[PDB]
Amino acid sequence: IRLTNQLKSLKGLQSKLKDVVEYLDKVIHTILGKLQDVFNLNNLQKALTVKTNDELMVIYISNLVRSIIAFDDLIENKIQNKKIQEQRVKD
């Protein structure tokens, strides 16, 4: 779902660019200003990424913990299944 959303965003840009190009050709306003602002707002992320890296590490650790918990419950389930099988055999 996230991917589809991202694609939609990029799609707008692509189409937007095409429109701009055509617009310029014809010319040869507000939208332009808006675009400029967006531009000013990955490059910058570079320095910001430094921090993101630290936070990514934290959220990786959390995921690992969750995985462990899941494994625990999984083991219990397996044990239960085994017990059931044994009971059936006895019957």
Binding site: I61, L64, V65, I68, D72, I75
Partner: peptide, 26 residues
């Protein structure tokens, strides 16, 4: 970096214990 490594080490420790339990089950 040291501090960060500390937490990472602990996480690894727990992971080891979990693995041990799995082996025992098998």
């Amino acid at each position: 970096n040291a501090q960060y490594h500390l937490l990472v080490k602990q996480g690894d420790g727990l992971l080891t214990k979990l693995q041990k339990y799995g082996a025992a089950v098998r």
